[PDB]
Design a protein around this ligand. Structure first.
Ligand code: GSH
Ligand code: GSH
Ligand code: EZE
Ligand code: EZE
Lengths: 235, 235
């Protein structure tokens, strides 16, 4: 494939989707990463890379240039789920996209549940807006799609890429009591989510497997995330 | 491919996406359609086909059975955008999915704008919730992605499938003054959208081309839609 520059940020789970995808394709050492400071974005980022002014975004092809001077001739691409499929399409030996048309649809349907159920329910609960039960129910939607063993469609896929960055950050929030509830309530909900027992037993096992995946650990600065999350809660 | 039963409804633009996709693949005469009455859904639909109780949904493979007695052995698939990619994946000579990985990402990015900008802005404006300007701005987002000529990525694609059912219904709403504004305001906004002149000139030409597409006209019961839309407004 042509040259890839990835504009990302350690804090952002949507960006980590693309870092995981690249690592699964064993291409993480072929791509140039540029870290965007989301509190002080470069003035050239929105006009020259991504008018939405968000990470992730990729610059594809074109000449060799410094990443803070992206070329007009590279193709600019945004939206994390689209970029994960692009990486899958460019590096087929990653095996991120299943060959079988039914398994592809089932992987993408799982992603739809991550998008429309897990993430909004996690955001609402972690922000103190909604109930614990609203979050757990959304998790049960995903659990019910899981096969008896393995990842979301058996073999690891784009489905697992989409979810994992949000799971790993939810763990930090809950482990550290940053979820807006009294001390100890965070850790109890974490245990429900990941113990492997109880109402979310099957999801718990799956969660253990997602967080053990090499690509996740390699793209996840737990110390940095935990520090940012404590500071944010402190306000 | 194996046998396809499509559970659909004439009124539903999300379902029409899948009918268009099948017709572009020139497979509309190979699939069994079953019309779901959304005001009186069959008691077996949610438990046996789609627990979300929405159209579209596909039953794939399994034995030959009456469509009101779907088999446990067929694979049940839902979500219109996923089903459009499934149809593309099953009938490659449809040319719905571009070969080139960049063009695929650009087609899917256009779909993201249809999903996150056009449809919500159309819903809010047609329901009397928001301003005309909020709707037109969202249309301009899509316009800015269009190439100098052709469809969303040049050759017709899944991008055009995603948008067209909503455009054709918006036309009926606006042509017939069903948008919650005084007589004549609907038709004026239609002219902005589709005249080919003015602030939305390029989109207007594109809109003419989408509504002339054979697959759209063949899957669009304009008389039925117009009758349902007048009755709904009458309440
Ligand atoms: N829908 C986008 C969302 C990405 C997104 O929200 N990124 C955040 C950080 S995690 C961002 O860059 N925010 C910057 C801003 O809103 O100014 C995707 O999936 O790529
Ligand atoms: N996200 C779904 C939405 C489909 C949808 O909303 N279908 C409507 C009709 S246009 C439906 O079946 N509604 C039935 C109900 O909500 O009870 C998709 O794209 O497939
Ligand atoms: O410093 C900044 C600036 C900014 O604009 C966004 C962010 C973080 C966004 C984010 C984090 C977690 C998540 O689940 C979803 C998110 O969008 C951090
Ligand atoms: O009789 C029924 C029952 C029901 O549950 C939904 C519908 C229509 C839904 C619909 C139409 C247009 C659109 O832009 C979006 C929509 O979801 C009609």
């Amino acid at each position: 494939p042509e040259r890839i520059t990835l504009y990302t940020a350690k804090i952002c789970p949507f960006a980590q989707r693309v870092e995981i995808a690249l690592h699964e394709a064993k291409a993480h050492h072929n791509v140039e990463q540029f870290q965007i400071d989301l509190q002080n974005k470069p003035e050239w980022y929105a006009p020259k890379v991504n008018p939405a002014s968000k990470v992730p975004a990729i610059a594809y092809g074109g000449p060799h240039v410094p990443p803070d001077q992206p070329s007009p001739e590279s193709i600019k691409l945004a939206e994390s789920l689209i970029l994960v499929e692009f990486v899958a399409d460019l590096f087929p030996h990653s095996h991120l996209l299943p060959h079988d048309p039914v398994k592809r649809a089932q992987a993408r349907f799982f992603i739809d549940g991550v998008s429309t159920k897990f993430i909004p329910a996690w955001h609402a609960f972690s922000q103190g807006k909604s109930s614990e039960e609203d979050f757990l129910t959304a998790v049960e939607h995903l659990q019910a799609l899981l096969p008896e063993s393995g990842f979301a469609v058996g073999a690891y896929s784009i489905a697992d890429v989409a979810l994992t960055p949000f799971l790993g950050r939810a763990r930090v929030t809950l482990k550290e009591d940053l979820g807006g509830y009294p001390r100890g309530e965070g850790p109890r909900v974490l245990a429900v989510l990941t113990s492997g027992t109880g109402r979310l037993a099957r999801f718990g096992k799956y969660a253990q497997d997602l967080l053990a995946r090499e690509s996740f650990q390699a793209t996840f600065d737990e110390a940095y995330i935990t520090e940012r999350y404590k500071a944010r809660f402190a306000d």
